[PDB]
């Protein structure tokens, strides 16, 4: 129950590794979803692959 604008993150370069397996990064705003869960954590450098 909010407004999710994902274009600000795509326009401004921040994330070093950004990949969407389920959907397209440009279609995140076009198609929207009900529940959004974000799991935040930190890992060693080589463990991101």
């Amino acid at each position: 129950n909010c407004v999710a604008d994902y274009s600000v993150l795509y326009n401004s370069a921040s994330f070093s590794t950004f990949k969407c397996y389920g959907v397209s990064p440009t279609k995140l705003n076009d198609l929207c979803f009900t529940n959004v869960y974000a799991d935040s954590f930190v890992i060693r450098g080589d463990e991101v692959r």
Binding site: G22, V23, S24, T26, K27, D30, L31
Partner: protein, 50 residues
């Protein structure tokens, strides 16, 4: 004869609900989710089965 044609038509319509290995049967969902080059992979599966 009437029942035979009814079953053939009904069966033909029910195949549209089948995924045929694709993520989803609806074409608008594939276009609204996967990238243009990625959507072709899923669209090919639907066309193949259909």
């Amino acid at each position: 004869v009437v029942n035979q044609n009814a079953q053939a038509l009904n069966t033909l319509v029910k195949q549209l609900s089948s995924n045929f290995g694709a993520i989803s049967s609806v074409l608008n969902d594939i276009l609204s989710r996967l990238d243009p080059p990625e959507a072709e992979v899923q669209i090919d599966r639907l066309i193949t089965g259909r």
